[PDB]
Amino acid sequence: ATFVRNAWYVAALPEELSEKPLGRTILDTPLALYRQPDGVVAALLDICPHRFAPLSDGILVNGHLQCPYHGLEFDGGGQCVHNPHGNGARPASLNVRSFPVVERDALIWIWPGDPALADPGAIPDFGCRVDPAYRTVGGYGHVDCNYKLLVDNLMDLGHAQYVHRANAQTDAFDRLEREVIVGDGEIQALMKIPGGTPSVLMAKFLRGANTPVDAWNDIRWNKVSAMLNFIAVAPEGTPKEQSIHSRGTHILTPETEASCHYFFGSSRNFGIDDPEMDGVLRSWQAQALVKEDKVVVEAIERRRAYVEANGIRPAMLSCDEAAVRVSREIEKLEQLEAAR
């Protein structure tokens, strides 16, 4: 598998983690992820340097992760801090690899490449997730596809018109206005849907109001595979910036070449103290993201062998510009990294 290792990836949502380790593989690298007694998250290679047992099946002893096999103890920097055996000697050979972690924007970011190069300034901005003006709900999904298929999915949100038609179909789809803005390490795909009846989802945002609206569904990509969308709806002619909206976290992290982790969320500026609106967004996430999109991209992954064996290449449509530009940027990053 080719992955871009010198980049930050979301490995977990903070609420997934505790003093009980979580074993999760990112970029074909098995990790043991836990929150220490002092609250700091650690990420260790989930392979004990002694005989390769899963540290993730161990427990904390004195805030130190104890290997379940012969009881070596490790701190969050991977240092072996206790060896129960013989003279108890702890040479550097017993230290386990530790991965840089930044807990930011209610995300656990990990750097899986050269730890010397881990630069917190490179972490994409998802500040809305911790902004008290936004209400955020979301979760985790596992998907049996190459993460690039879900990047493709997200970078053409037009797919919602079909894949999510029961919730997302608009009668103004024929009048979509698209632009693509290309920045440095960042690409935006903008979509405005002018003058339509609100979709079923947008009508729920508005609490049933069914008169004509403008809607937007923009998305921002940052390398490698972190996206933030803007789903918004307002009375015709009222500015974007004044709209009720959800900024959607859509972040992918490769697991294996043919599987990935999907971290999703909605950060909304409306109905902030409304458990029933929470439910609308959670049920949307459960149906759209973890069911419908999964089913499409997992089917596409199953067709990979045929496509490759037969030299089949995708045929592009007018809606693909942003997805293609992103795909080419990822490929470029992949090749740059394969040189190092």
Add this chain to the structure above:
Amino acid sequence: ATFVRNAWYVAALPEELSEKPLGRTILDTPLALYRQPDGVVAALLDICPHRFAPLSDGILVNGHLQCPYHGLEFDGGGQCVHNPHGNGARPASLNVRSFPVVERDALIWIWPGDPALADPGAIPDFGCRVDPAYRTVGGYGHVDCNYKLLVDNLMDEREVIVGDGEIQALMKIPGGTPSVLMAKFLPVDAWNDIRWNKVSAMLNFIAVAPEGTPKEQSIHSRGTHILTPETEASCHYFFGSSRNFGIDDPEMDGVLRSWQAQALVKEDKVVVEAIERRRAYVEANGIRPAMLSCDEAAVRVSREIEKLEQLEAA
């Protein structure tokens, strides 16, 4: 990934198909099989030309299959007939592969190979299946073995008659014994014949009459036994019978629709699936099967298949 692609295979029974597409893989080729509003069956490659979504997860829009991902619509010839996006242009690059398909003898026949060579006149004759003189019932099953194993099993006064892409194994038993099924409709002759056509389509003839009687006027069933490879190690099995006895008996219909009664009893499925699991060992150790006297027809068939494979190798 060794198949004989240049041949007609059954992909479905007609009763499986409707305006809701069926996704089924034959010879490692995923198909979307559906009936258009005019009744006519279409068979498209189950891979959208845009981004490779399963067209079989789509629905018809004005009789045209719509990709479930971004809404490209296709006709039964695979032509893209609507592009929702932008200027709506439909360059030839948006067309999807369509397979030669013939509905005949209550079977859906598909040609997975070189479409230039697909001659509908070469489709095997299963006419009994739509002959009103016969009551025809049957069904479908899936098996986790190479189809050749089931062909071998099927093909096991004798005579074996060998022709070009057809082989017949005939057996007559004078003073023979009615099958349990037929006994009650009767000093008998019995017949058990089977006909193979390339690659894996068989029709048997199981019959009993008073001695003397033209086997053509016997009490008899003609059994449909048609295999289609799914992967190298799995197959589809279409079975059925066309009978001239008890034609209005629904209980008889029932037992003749049973997979285990008519096609493959569980104990034999266990055996053939186990044989498939021994393939790796057999190949690694250069082990070849040892044939018995009962294998004569199966061997002849096996050799013809291998020749057809070898042709396609280049």
Add this chain to the structure above:
Amino acid sequence: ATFVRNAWYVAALPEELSEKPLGRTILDTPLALYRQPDGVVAALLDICPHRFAPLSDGILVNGHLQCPYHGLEFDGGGQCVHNPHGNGARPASLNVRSFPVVERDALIWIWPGDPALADPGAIPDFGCRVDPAYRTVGGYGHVDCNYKLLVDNLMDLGHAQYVHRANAQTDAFDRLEREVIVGDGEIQALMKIPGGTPSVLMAKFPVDAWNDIRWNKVSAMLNFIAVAPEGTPKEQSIHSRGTHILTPETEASCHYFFGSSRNFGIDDPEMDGVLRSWQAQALVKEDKVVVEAIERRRAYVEANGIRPAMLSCDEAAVRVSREIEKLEQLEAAR
């Protein structure tokens, strides 16, 4: 992948075998194992020479294994003895491979390698299993690891302080002493565990305990777990001699034959229960979970050239591992 094929392996416990065949794969070789009416065990390649059906799914007819598919019948030497078809001729091509088998010490040993070379004198000694002075209970487990991982597990029995902490803990761990003695195709790790409080298990039979293990090539081990009052001679201890015998199934899976042969409470059903409970919990659950997890990490370890870092407890396991690697490479280079 690479196995030591020229060696005896346990393929079954005798109690697993009957006139109903058992299909089991050893060293990537599928076998049909059964007991003939005269009591003699046969082991045939589980691939009918006709069309490759599992003979192990058939039954015996007049003491002969009958293929379930078209009913060829075979004797214990693999000779085809009946062909129900045609003239019933039995050409030599119908015979099936039969493997050398020795039933000894309440074990079924099979030689999967060059049959010219199978010397029954080479089978290691597990005589306690049929010694009237000992009571033996045990069984079979399947494990999704390469057998060498479970050899490691068994040869460093100081994982029991952690993996088996609920049953096997003892404070005296601080003060382990462990002696490795190397012999010819045989390695032992010995151990006094002195003056200590007994582990939960020991209590179920201040104490001295011992926990020795003997390995013989390829992967056959017998341990010695013993406790006695402080100051008591190792040899007057109540003890269990543990059968711990591994046989490769595939590159990444194995068969585990375990047993306890004890010299105490030998008429006592409650003790049977303590031992069978330990075997169930320790060997088939806890150790299984660890080694199966390590197996899953193999791809990463190999891809990244990672080598193990050894501790003071590892000598015996390392010596054994070196001997197996040596046998494995000695064979593949011929």
